[PDB]
Amino acid sequence: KVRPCIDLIDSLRALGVEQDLALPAIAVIGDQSSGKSSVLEALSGVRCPLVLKLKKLNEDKVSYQDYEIEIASEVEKEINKAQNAHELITLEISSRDVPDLTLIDLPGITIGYKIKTLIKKYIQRQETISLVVVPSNVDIATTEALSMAQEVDPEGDRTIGILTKPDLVDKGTEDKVVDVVRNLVFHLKKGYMIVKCRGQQEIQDQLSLSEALQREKIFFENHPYFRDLLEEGKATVPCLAEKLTSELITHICKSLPLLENQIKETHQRITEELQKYGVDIPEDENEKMFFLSDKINAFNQDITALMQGEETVGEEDIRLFTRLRHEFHKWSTIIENNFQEGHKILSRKIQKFYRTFETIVKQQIKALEEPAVDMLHTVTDMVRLAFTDVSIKNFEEFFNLHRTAKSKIEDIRAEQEREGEKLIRLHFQDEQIEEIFQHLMAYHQEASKRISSHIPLIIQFFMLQTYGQQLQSAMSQLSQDKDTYSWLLKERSDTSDKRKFLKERLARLTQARRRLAQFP
């Protein structure tokens, strides 16, 4: 309760988690000449977002990005150095008088469009308490500070007001200031406080900061309007310090369960989104082999589905096997047309008044040779298209795997298609082997059937079965050649990087859980 509640969040902040996760905080809103700079001086005792981690010392540190310096006089120079070097700068101070309190200071309001958005970036989170610093003589209605605070915190339930430099309050309107601090104008759950600090003329001398601590108490003890606010514990820096730490702790404690609820669901969101980008490539050579082999197996199964007309397809389209059945139907029609036209051609020679007629049927049969070979070509093209479309679906992220697959797909096409043409072509050399009209016409039906049957079977044999077979064999052999694993498993840098960032994000999220679970 004492100090740990604060130690908790700040280390979660040091985790770099704050980008994935909202951490309980007091954000310090600065105005134009609000003198906020001086108020922090009062608490600390000594621009892109500054984190003030304050710890009060018996026994008796600055970090820009990764690096740090150690000592209290030198602090001023280290600050301005780090800046020149929107990223968090943390400052940890420890002395007997400094409060136990962590604040985050933002650039004061005034390329301005950007500062609002930076400020809004912190303020809009219901886990942020907006700590508004405005000079007390100016109307609070006009101040940009409150307006921002109000834009984000409509009900004033996460905002705290600091009125500054109560000297320059126009005489006659002291009671208006008192109504604001007493909460009578714009109502804040967490309230108002008023403080007096280092003005223009003392910052030039820079007389001692602890002497100023005694300069407040006599300003408020003697002031006729504000003496009443001190009796009510709403005036001075030491009072301000106590209230802030009281309020911070109350916030952190209130916030915890809704936060442990928030980390879980974020963890999920990252892990769900992490799924879409595959998995890591194993360091171990053997695990590498199993990884590649599994990838080969799924390619090889998608190829298999094609071979069997089993592959999963769209509602309108049809399976490759079926598309080849339609080619094969077109082919039968070609046989049918060839058969009858040969019938017409033969009657035009027999009643034109033996082996002259044998030759004529033979020529009618040979004419089918090119339809057959075209069909060979037409079908390999379909399968090649199919096989490469599988290689796309499986190996896009692994371009060498895809490159290699394509290469085999092409190499085995050239080989199988050659073999298929050979057998088709040779089939039409093997073929040279009114009672005459019939004998020839019956001979003609036999030959066609032979041809109508074998040609598709050869096409199917070489360009679908043997083709798929060999390719699968070829791919499966990649797993034997270990010194190519490094090349084959090279993957796209785009998704390779996307995964890398998420794993890092998820890592920091996991540490967070760990430290949060440790605390109770």
Residue numbers in the entry: 48 to 93, 104 to 114, 116 to 118, 123 to 133, 136 to 149, 159 to 183, 194 to 436, 451 to 530, ...
Which passages does the manuscript contain on this structure?
Myxovirus resistance (Mx) proteins are key mediators of interferon-induced innate immune response in vertebrates.
To verify their architectures, we determined a 2.9 Å nucleotide-free crystal structure of a monomeric MxA construct (termed MxAMO1) containing the following modifications: (i) deletion of N-terminal 32 residues and part of L4S (residues 533–561 inclusive), (ii) point mutations in interface 1 (I376S, K614S, L617S and L620S) and interface 2 (M527D). The overall folding and domain distribution of MxAMO1 shows a high consistency with MxAFL. Moreover, the infrastructure of MxAMO1 hinge 1 remains intact, and a higher quality of diffraction data compared to that of MxAFL revealed that the previously unexplained K644 of α3B, a conserved residue among Mx proteins, is involved in the BSE-hinge 1 association by forming a salt bridge with D363 of L1BS. Altogether, the MxAMO1 structure indicates that disruption of the oligomerization interfaces of the stalk does not affect the architecture of MxA. To explain this result, we reviewed the crystal structure of MxAMO1 at the corresponding region. Hinge 1 is substantially attached to the proximal end of the stalk via a hydrophobic network which allows very limited relative movement. On the other side, salt bridge pairs involving D363-R640 and E632-K644 from BSE and hinge 1 may act as a key bracket that supports the BSE from hinge 1 while allowing a certain level of elasticity. Thus, mutation of the central R640 would engender the collapse of this bracket, hence the structural defects of MxA. Sites 352 and 500 span 35.3 and 35.6 Å in crystal structures of apo MxAMO2 and MxAFL, respectively.
